[PDB]
Design an enzyme around this catalytic site. Sequence first.
Site, mmCIF file in Angstrom:
data_model
loop_
_atom_site.group_PDB
_atom_site.id
_atom_site.type_symbol
_atom_site.label_atom_id
_atom_site.label_comp_id
_atom_site.label_asym_id
_atom_site.label_seq_id
_atom_site.Cartn_x
_atom_site.Cartn_y
_atom_site.Cartn_z
ATOM 1 N N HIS A 1 0.814 -1.218 0.000
ATOM 2 C CA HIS A 1 0.000 0.000 0.000
ATOM 3 C C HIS A 1 0.851 1.274 0.000
ATOM 4 O O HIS A 1 0.664 2.158 -0.838
ATOM 5 C CB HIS A 1 -0.911 -0.002 1.233
ATOM 6 C CG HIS A 1 -1.760 1.223 1.377
ATOM 7 N ND1 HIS A 1 -3.054 1.295 0.904
ATOM 8 C CD2 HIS A 1 -1.515 2.412 1.980
ATOM 9 C CE1 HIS A 1 -3.572 2.472 1.213
ATOM 10 N NE2 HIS A 1 -2.657 3.169 1.866
ATOM 11 N N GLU A 2 1.775 1.366 0.951
ATOM 12 C CA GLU A 2 2.634 2.529 1.072
ATOM 13 C C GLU A 2 3.523 2.704 -0.171
ATOM 14 O O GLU A 2 3.701 3.821 -0.671
ATOM 15 C CB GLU A 2 3.511 2.402 2.326
ATOM 16 C CG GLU A 2 2.757 2.143 3.643
ATOM 17 C CD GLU A 2 1.594 3.095 3.877
ATOM 18 O OE1 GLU A 2 1.604 4.219 3.336
ATOM 19 O OE2 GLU A 2 0.669 2.719 4.619
ATOM 20 N N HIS B 1 1.678 4.337 -2.892
ATOM 21 C CA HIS B 1 1.649 5.798 -2.879
ATOM 22 C C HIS B 1 2.943 6.308 -3.505
ATOM 23 O O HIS B 1 2.929 7.259 -4.287
ATOM 24 C CB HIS B 1 1.547 6.338 -1.446
ATOM 25 C CG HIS B 1 0.188 6.215 -0.844
ATOM 26 N ND1 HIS B 1 -0.939 6.751 -1.433
ATOM 27 C CD2 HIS B 1 -0.229 5.645 0.311
ATOM 28 C CE1 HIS B 1 -1.987 6.519 -0.667
ATOM 29 N NE2 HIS B 1 -1.587 5.849 0.400
ATOM 30 N N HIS C 1 -5.754 6.603 -2.846
ATOM 31 C CA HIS C 1 -6.697 5.635 -2.301
ATOM 32 C C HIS C 1 -7.856 5.358 -3.260
ATOM 33 O O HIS C 1 -8.321 6.262 -3.967
ATOM 34 C CB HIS C 1 -7.244 6.141 -0.969
ATOM 35 C CG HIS C 1 -6.247 6.100 0.143
ATOM 36 N ND1 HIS C 1 -6.389 6.838 1.297
ATOM 37 C CD2 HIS C 1 -5.091 5.407 0.280
ATOM 38 C CE1 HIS C 1 -5.364 6.607 2.095
ATOM 39 N NE2 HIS C 1 -4.562 5.741 1.501
HETATM 40 C C1 LIG Z 1 -3.611 -5.309 6.225
HETATM 41 C C2 LIG Z 1 -4.338 -4.820 5.046
HETATM 42 C C3 LIG Z 1 -3.876 -3.656 4.373
HETATM 43 C C4 LIG Z 1 -4.574 -3.166 3.220
HETATM 44 C C5 LIG Z 1 -4.101 -1.899 2.468
HETATM 45 O O1 LIG Z 1 -3.056 -1.185 3.169
HETATM 46 C C6 LIG Z 1 -3.491 -0.241 4.127
HETATM 47 C C7 LIG Z 1 -2.517 0.375 4.960
HETATM 48 C C8 LIG Z 1 -2.910 1.319 5.949
HETATM 49 C C9 LIG Z 1 -4.286 1.669 6.113
HETATM 50 C C10 LIG Z 1 -4.689 2.696 7.155
HETATM 51 C C11 LIG Z 1 -5.076 2.022 8.454
HETATM 52 C C12 LIG Z 1 -5.769 3.678 6.604
HETATM 53 C C13 LIG Z 1 -5.046 5.020 6.368
HETATM 54 N N1 LIG Z 1 -3.686 4.746 6.792
HETATM 55 C C14 LIG Z 1 -2.585 5.594 6.385
HETATM 56 C C15 LIG Z 1 -2.900 7.043 6.748
HETATM 57 C C16 LIG Z 1 -2.358 5.435 4.897
HETATM 58 O O2 LIG Z 1 -3.300 5.442 4.107
HETATM 59 N N2 LIG Z 1 -1.079 5.277 4.560
HETATM 60 O O3 LIG Z 1 -0.756 5.115 3.224
HETATM 61 C C17 LIG Z 1 -3.499 3.599 7.458
HETATM 62 O O4 LIG Z 1 -2.567 3.325 8.199
HETATM 63 C C18 LIG Z 1 -5.266 1.052 5.282
HETATM 64 C C19 LIG Z 1 -4.872 0.110 4.293
HETATM 65 C C20 LIG Z 1 -5.741 -3.868 2.779
HETATM 66 C C21 LIG Z 1 -6.481 -3.432 1.638
HETATM 67 C C22 LIG Z 1 -7.639 -4.146 1.213
HETATM 68 C C23 LIG Z 1 -8.067 -5.306 1.920
HETATM 69 C C24 LIG Z 1 -7.348 -5.766 3.059
HETATM 70 C C25 LIG Z 1 -6.186 -5.064 3.494
HETATM 71 N N3 LIG Z 1 -5.456 -5.481 4.610
HETATM 72 ZN ZN LIG Z 2 -2.687 5.197 2.127
#
Ligand SMILES: Cc1cc(COc2ccc([C@]3(C)CCN([C@H](C)C(=O)NO)C3=O)cc2)c2ccccc2n1
Ligand SMILES: [Zn+2]
Length: 261
Positions: free
Chosen positions: A190-191, A194, A200
């Site tokens: 995810h990171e 970005h 998002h």
């Molecule tokens: C463990 C996991 C991770 C993801 C996608 O990765 C993230 C990482 C962080 C966040 C949050 C909790 C929301 C916002 N956030 C920060 C601010 C962010 O967006 N960083 O890039 C977070 O730490 C949400 C999804 C997933 C995406 C879809 C389904 C399951 C998932 N399970």
């Molecule tokens: Zn994010």
Amino acid sequence: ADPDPMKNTCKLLVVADHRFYRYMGRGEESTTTNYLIELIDRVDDIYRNTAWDNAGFKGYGIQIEQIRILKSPQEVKPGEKHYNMAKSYPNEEKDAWDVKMLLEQFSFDIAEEASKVCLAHLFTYQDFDMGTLGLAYGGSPRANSHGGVCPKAYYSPVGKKNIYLNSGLTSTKNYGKTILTKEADLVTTHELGHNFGAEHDPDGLAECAPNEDQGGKYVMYPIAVSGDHENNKMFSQCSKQSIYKTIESKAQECFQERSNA
Ligand SMILES: Cc1cc(COc2ccc([C@]3(C)CCN([C@H](C)C(=O)NO)C3=O)cc2)c2ccccc2n1
Ligand SMILES: [Zn+2]
């Protein structure tokens, strides 16, 4: 399209702070590095197999160039801070730093190293408030915001020097427990997403935010849904389109040839 094989890999500077070393690495270098090596490799598999144009434009990935292992906390003088210091900032009574301030501090402290790599990523072990797992520059709708793959300078008025926005961070601790490796993989993916330019996925675009019965959400969804569904480990069409706009130019700017494994 048709990726340059001499420039298809974003080399990373991976940093494990003292918290990660102690709680994830069991205070051992081998354990610490093995975890990170395998994580980045699994994430690399996702990037590599992704066709950014839904054609044959794939093969872009990431590889570790160097792993910095901080075995102990950075000692600091009164009033001075460092991303690897023992205390959290700004509230030393909390288990973790304010995530945004930590990312900023990390970038400041490793600016010199970051100027020479495609990306720098901090791996830590602290319980960010309200379930936050990670943070990164790039792929942000916020105004005046920038960052991502390839060092981009930003003069810090407070820091009095140039820092680079080719950074991001991941914590493998959330709600008092070590997160699953399958969840860690998704956070870093995810990171780095970005960093590669993706924002998002919005609910307003069903194609990019499917229901649980349609494979679930993709990796750039702003909420950590599970990691259990088929789409979780994939980039949506929205992410692919955003990342495809600048991936080639960025690749030519700082990507290198994949070192074999
Ligand atoms: C463990 C996991 C991770 C993801 C996608 O990765 C993230 C990482 C962080 C966040 C949050 C909790 C929301 C916002 N956030 C920060 C601010 C962010 O967006 N960083 O890039 C977070 O730490 C949400 C999804 C997933 C995406 C879809 C389904 C399951 C998932 N399970
Ligand atoms: Zn994010």
